[PDB]
Amino acid sequence: MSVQAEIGILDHVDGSSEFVSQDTKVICSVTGPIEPKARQELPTQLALEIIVRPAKGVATTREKVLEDKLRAVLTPLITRHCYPRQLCQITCQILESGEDEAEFSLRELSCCINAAFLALVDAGIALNSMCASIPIAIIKDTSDIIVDPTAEQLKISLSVHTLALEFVNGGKVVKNVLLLDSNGDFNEDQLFSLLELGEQKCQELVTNIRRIIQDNISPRLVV
Amino acid sequence: QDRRRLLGPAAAKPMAFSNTESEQELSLHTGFIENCNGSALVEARSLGHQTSLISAVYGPRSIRGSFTSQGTISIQLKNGLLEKYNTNELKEVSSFLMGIFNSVVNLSRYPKSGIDIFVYLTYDKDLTNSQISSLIPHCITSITLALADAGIELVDMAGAGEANGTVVSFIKNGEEIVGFWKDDGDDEDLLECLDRCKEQYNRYRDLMISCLMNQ
Amino acid sequence: VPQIRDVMERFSVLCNSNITNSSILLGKILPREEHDIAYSKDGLPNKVKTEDIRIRAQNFKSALANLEDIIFEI
Amino acid sequence: SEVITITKRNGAFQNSSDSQIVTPGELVTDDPIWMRGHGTYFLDNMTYSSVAGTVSRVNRLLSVIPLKGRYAPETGDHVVGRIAEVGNKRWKVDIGGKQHAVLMLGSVNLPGGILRRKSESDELQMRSFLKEGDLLNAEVQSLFQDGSASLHTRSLKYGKLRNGMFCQVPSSLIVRAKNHTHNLPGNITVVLGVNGYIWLRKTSQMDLARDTSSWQIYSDENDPSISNNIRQAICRYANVIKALAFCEIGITQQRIVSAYEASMVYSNVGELIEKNVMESIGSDILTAEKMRG
Amino acid sequence: ETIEIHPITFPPEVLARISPELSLQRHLSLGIRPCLRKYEEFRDVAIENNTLSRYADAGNIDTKNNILGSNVLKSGKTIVITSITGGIIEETEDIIANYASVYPVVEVERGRVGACTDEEMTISQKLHDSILHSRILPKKALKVKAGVRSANEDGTFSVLYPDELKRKWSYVLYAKIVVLSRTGPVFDLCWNSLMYALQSVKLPRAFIDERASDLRMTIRTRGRSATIRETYEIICDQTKSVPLMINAKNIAFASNYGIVELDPECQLQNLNTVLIADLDTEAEETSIHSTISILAAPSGNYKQLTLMGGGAKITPEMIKRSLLLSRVRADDLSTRFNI
Amino acid sequence: PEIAYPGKLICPQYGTENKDGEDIIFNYVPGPGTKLIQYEHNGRTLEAITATLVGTVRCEEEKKTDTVKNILVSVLPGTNDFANNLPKEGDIVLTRVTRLSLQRANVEILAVEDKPATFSVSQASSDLGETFRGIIRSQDVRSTDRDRVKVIECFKPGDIVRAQVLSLGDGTNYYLTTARNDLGVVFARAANGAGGLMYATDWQMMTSPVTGATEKRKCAKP
RNA sequence: AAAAUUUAAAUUUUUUUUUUUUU
Structure with a gap:
């Protein structure tokens, strides 16, 4: 599990986190709740605006959808009624690819969720549950399934997959699925098998994470 | 280039090719867009030339600007698929559009209220082996039907008729003119340019009122 | 009276002086009435009867406005 | 020709x-x-x-x-305002100066007078009595901390204009005197603002009252009886204003009368626009200034 | 205190404008949809293909038109028209690098003037993505085999075409989606309307000159020099054309799904967790939060699947149910218009 | 004169019957859907009542009590429209609360009722910010205790209010009131959508059944 | 020798991507 993270590493920003998995370095930033614009408010719930900068090039359409699916996942994570007529701008930076951006977007989508989850903990906003995302691929030639592949394995991968889950009761109960990003060729039969490791693995991920949060923040906490 | 769209790799290019009194006709339809409150559909086909276009209504929309006594019209001409008329070529027509309806619409019935008009020059055949001037009068007809569909207070079924690069718009069964447009043509052909426009106007308005009163 | 009658005279003649579609290209699909379909346990296409949903709507209007009159509650 | x-x-x-x-x-x-x-x-x-x-x-x-x-706005001055905007119970209105003047809601002559007292429903009718761009007679009350000042109409004599035409000039050439409403042969009246704004209209009875109904103080009506001999006489006084304005002339009420009678050379009123002839009549009065006083 | 609190009820058209959500909950009480449908009643789909391409008339292809294979789509209350053009760049098993796509541009005429809306900017990306993930298109299908126009005797031209095999060239295709009367989610109809346009695309016959006049030119440096390569402008034929080669066994179709959970309070007599597909009707699109969208080619194949779970849980069985409902709705449309 | 296209010329300004030997004059009075249009034809002028819309002719009359005859001309649709029923002064309009100021309250216009219930909802999409919005000022909520006004104790965002038009105001928004014992709050969900449905306890108070929770809203008389 | 006399300053949101200028 060659993952590792940092909390509270920016200065003027409410929530900040560096998430580092095996090859990709991504930092996310959270500022909120702050003053919303005119065209942006909601009378009841909390308004969210999300920016992802790539490592390379500028913000285009390829960025836009990875943003927007990430809009969908955070919306139930946030206790959105708690902050009416408000705004939390959240911003993600891709620093390292770790995957061919021309051909793939898979790991980053797993990465940025795992990034933005922790900067909210830095931010300390009313949230709902716990979460995790992993990238999963199925090899074209071997026809086997690897959790957390590499980009060369992505080249021989047949189908690329991202699973986002909602974890409660010690992060143990799968409360709901958040995202299942099925891409590539697949059938019925692989899919329930495709969950069935990530059923375990994301909890196994969070099992690491629960420790990490308290280790970083209980010395920031006072006794 | 444009960082907001997918325009392909730059060094590509589109594909290239080289050489190796008549009747106009309509098919007019309303009530088919659920975003709008006024829709109108127009087919046209005449002798080498087949044309289809869509007129869209949004109103009365609120005005964030300030107070007005009455209503305000906004008109958009947009290229469809094949034919590409020039940008500045478009808005000149949009200017010519608004003048006529400002002798049509009871804006005084609609204080502080907006009028949105979207015209989609969707598809045109010109198979013939002032190219925008041949499509002027059909716009006014296409707008009028959609504006009847939103049910807005209109004085007259006003229409324009065409005679060979010349566009003249009428009311009162042709007994007054509300909109004048002229390109090159002859000199002092105006009196015949009264006539052939008028009778198409005499044709068209009857085709329009059939499209609604029979529905 | 004859002045208004003169108007009623003159309203005659001027009002007397004033007094089929084929959709070639696209209009045979644009005001196409929409339909809905269904599949049975076979999965074979079952087009919706138009008459049912009107009765559904009249069922929908009925149990709405009548059963929402008095709500007897704790 | x-x-x-x-x-x-x-x-x-x-x-x-x-x-x-x-x-x-x-x-x-x-x-x-x-x-x-x-x-x-x-x-x-x-x-x-x-x-x-x-x-x-x-x-x-x-x-x-x-x-x-x-x-420069100063208090007690007799100027002309063009209605810019409407506020909460406030109005905005151009002086021509740096900023708008302000004008309180109860700062105006009410139809029926003071027997019409206050009402909160009056702010529901701000647009009733006044709306944009309109022209009137206004009385400069007092200022703010910056130099922006306000107005009012404490007379029947001040109020919304009608019965004529506007023109405008630089504020410099308008000379100060103890009087500003002036009545000219031709049964007509200049309302010289100080700020550079000039309204002409036909002499009213209230104008005639100065030298010997009340519900019409927000009307867009005129006297319906307006002859062309009124109307064309307006234009002759109209251009000679711009004649003196082009000739950089301090306005004397008599100079206008002197401008008018000197303009009686030309019956073709459209010829009152010429760069030379305005200067010629401009040259006439300055020579005529070297006789009297 | 036990109180008969009389509520206030309205016409239904009042209610949906007010509550998208409770008016939905009225329909769920009877178990219907506010688009007047029952749970699984699905919209009709109607097309015409190839009407707006110049290759409509096989007999007389006209002159100034530039459209390859066209598609009309109406389903429900939203008409969408798909148009295909193509361009050419001078070109110099089942793995992704064999696989290309097109360049689409969507517009939704949703009344708003202004720049490119963010809903649109997702769309042309999202299609292109799973088109790559469909693996439909080997670039062998883009390989262009040009002819040379032999300047023959007495001033006549015949294009020598080679057959069955120095530079190479490649088609690059384009799309445009216009969206009229948006009533709900659009992506499935964005998908499916393209698919029928894809099958109607002819590849026009491209050729180069016999020996083009546009030849090599030199550019002087500050003492040195180089040579511009000869500019062989490819020309497509006014007449001849070939069709398009497709991995036809991967042509998917689209379907969305929604799962909701129910209030006891909202019933009107004439847990509980209901699957709805064929989603529309703003109130639905507001209030459904756990959703499923699927691509599938009719033999049990799947180009993609899309889960956003934000409302209910997801059972393993609503999955299989939607899968059962996937292979129906797609396969009918494969067989519906038989293109 | 029964069914009308816009531009259908209908009748002159005046008409004549003879009801029993004494002469009776008609006065055709222009209403909605109408316009008097002068018409010169072969020399002589003529004013006429003009159909300006789509649907049906309707001629009516009523004299104000509190041989000529006035006849109101009235033009309608006939076998979905709201520009027909744009809000005028004094109307009763159902609105949804947008934002709560200490100054005032802001809503958007959604639905207009009618006289002798009959309504006209707007068919617009608020998610464009399209619709007409209005403003309730906080002292205009009611007249009883109109000074020390506590705004939060009557309204929350997103809620439904039977309110009366004060006037036009600006072009941007409206002058609006609720200042009656029959007017005010119609319906909302608990905790602004975060909970169930709430019922007006009195005319002056509101609770919720399943919860056991109440809130202060300036509810309408039911 | 008393008596007293004067003021008043203004509040809550509408817009279109970056080349490319003579050793």
Whole structure:
């Protein structure tokens, strides 16, 4: 599990986190709740605006959808009624690819969720549950399934997959699925098998994470 | 280039090719867009030339600007698929559009209220082996039907008729003119340019009122 | 009276002086009435009867406005 | 017998009483005894002008009056406002100066007068009595901390205009006197604003009342009885205003009368627009200024 | 205190404008949809293909038109028209690098003037993505085999075409989606309307000159020099054309799904967790939060699947149910218009 | 004169019957859907009542009590429209609360009722910010205790209010009131959508059944 | 020798991507 993270590493920003998995370095930033614009408010719930900068090039359409699916996942994570007529701008930076951006977007989508989850903990906003995302691929030639592949394995991968889950009761109960990003060729039969490791693995991920949060923040906490 | 769209790799290019009194006709339809409150559909086909276009209504929309006594019209001409008329070529027509309806619409019935008009020059055949001037009068007809569909207070079924690069718009069964447009043509052909426009106007308005009163 | 009658005279003649579609290209699909379909346990296409949903709507209007009159509650 | 003045000049972009005239950045003096007012800034002695203008030394007060600038609003002045906006119970209205004047809700003559007292429903009818761009007679009350001032209509004599036509001038040529409403043969009346705004209209009975119904103080109506002999006589007084404005002439009420009778050479009223002839009549009056007084 | 609190009820058209959500909950009480449908009643789909391409008339292809294979789509209350053009760049098993796509541009005429809306900017990306993930298109299908126009005797031209095999060239295709009367989610109809346009695309016969006049030119450096390569402008034929080669066994179709959970309060007599597909009707699109969208080619194949779970849980069985409902709705449309 | 296209010329300004030997004059009075249009034909002028819309002719009359005859001309649709029923002064309009100021309250216009219930909802999409919005000022909520006004104790965002038009105001928004014992709050969900449905306890108070929770809203008389 | 006399300053949101200028 060659993952590792940092909390509270920016200065003027409410929530900040560096998430580092095996090859990709991504930092996310959270500022909120702050003053919303005119065209942006909601009378009841909390308004969210999300920016992802790539490592390379500028913000285009390829960025836009990875943003927007990430809009969908955070919306139930946030206790959105708690902050009416408000705004939390959240911003993600891709620093390292770790995957061919021309051909793939898979790991980053797993990465940025795992990034933005922790900067909210830095931010300390009313949230709902716990979460995790992993990238999963199925090899074209071997026809086997690897959790957390590499980009060369992505080249021989047949189908690329991202699973986002909602974890409660010690992060143990799968409360709901958040995202299942099925891409590539697949059938019925692989899919329930495709969950069935990530059923375990994301909890196994969070099992690491629960420790990490308290280790970083209980010395920031006072006794 | 444009960082907001997918325009392909730059060094590509589109594909290239080289050489190796008549009747106009309509098919007019309303009530088919659920975003709008006024829709109108127009087919046209005449002798080498087949044309289809869509007129869209949004109103009365609120005005964030300030107070007005009455209503305000906004008109958009947009290229469809094949034919590409020039940008500045478009808005000149949009200017010519608004003048006529400002002798049509009871804006005084609609204080502080907006009028949105979207015209989609969707598809045109010109198979013939002032190219925008041949499509002027059909716009006014296409707008009028959609504006009847939103049910807005209109004085007259006003229409324009065409005679060979010349566009003249009428009311009162042709007994007054509300909109004048002229390109090159002859000199002092105006009196015949009264006539052939008028009778198409005499044709068209009857085709329009059939499209609604029979529905 | 004859002045208004003169108007009623003159309203005659001027009002007397004033007094089929084929959709070639696209209009045979644009005001196409929409339909809905269904599949049975076979999965074979079952087009919706138009008459049912009107009765559904009249069922929908009925149990709405009548059963929402008095709500007897704790 | 023409249509247009087309005179040609090709090959060029352009054709090309003593007092202190000072510049910005310039020292006046460093006598400390002087006081430092408008157009003046300083460093403890160094008296420094800030505009193109004149040194004014008033008895110990030194100050710089400029030559160029917008209209300066002062209290008690008789000017003309064009309605800019409507506020909460406020209105905005152009002076022509730096900023708008303000105008309180109850600052105006009510139809029926004071027997009509206050009402909160009146702010539901601000647009009833007034709306945008309209012209009126206004009385300059007092100011704010900056130099922006306000208005009111404390008379029947002040109120919303009708029965004529507007024109406008630079504020400089309008001379100050103890009177501003003036009545001219031709049964008509000039309403010279101070600020540079000029309204003509037909002489009313209230105008006639100055020298010997009330529900019509927000009307857009005129007297329906307006002859062309009224209307064409308006235009003759209209152009001679711009004649003096083009000729840089201080307005005397009599000079206008002198402008009018000198304009009786020309019955073709459309010929009152000529650069030379306005200057000619402009040259007439200045020569005629060298006889009387 | 036990109180008969009389509520206030309205016409239904009042209610949906007010509550998108409770008016939905009225329909769920009877178990219907506010688009007047029952749970699984699905919209009709109607097309015409190839009407707006110049290759409509096989007999007389006209002159100034530039459209390859066209598609009309109406389903429900939203008409969408798909148009295909193509361009050419001078070109110099089942793995992704064999696989290309097109360049689409969507517009939704949703009344708003202004710049490119953010809903649109997702769309042309999202299609292109799973088109790559469909693996439909080997670039062998883009390989262009040009002819040379032999300047023959007495001033006549015949294009020598080679057959069955120095530079190479490649088609690059384009799309445009216009969206009229948006009533709900659009992506499935964005998908499916393209698919029928894809099958109607002819590849026009491209050829180069026999020996083009546009030849090599030199450019002087500050003492040195180089040579511009000869500019062989490819020309497509006014007449001849070939069709398009497709991995036809991967042509998917689209379907969305929604799962909701129910209030006891909202019933009107004439847990509980209901699957709805064929989603529309703003109130639905507001209030459904756990959703499923699927691509599938009719033999049990799947180009993609899309889960956003934000409302209910997801059972393993609503999955299989939607899968059962997937292979129906797609396969009918494969067989519906038989293109 | 029964069914009308816009531009259908209908009747002159005046008409004549003879009801029993004494002469009776008609006065055709222009209403909605109408316009008097002068018409010169072969020399002589003529004013006429003009159909300006789509649907049906309807001629009516009523004299104000509190041989000529006035006849109101009235033009309608006939066998979905709201520009027909744009809000005028004094109307009763159902609105949804947008934002709560200490100054005031802001809503958007959604639905207009009618006289002798009959309604006209707007068919617009608020998610464009399209619709007409209005403003309730906080002292205009009611007249009883109109000074020390506590705004939060009557309204929350997103809620439904039977409110009366004060006037036009600006072009941007409206002058609006609720200042009656029959007017005010119609319906909302608990905790602004975060909970169930709430019922007006009195005319002056509101609770919720399943919860056991109440809130202060200036509810309408039911 | 008393008596008293004067003021008043203004509040809550509408817009279109970056080349490319003579060793």
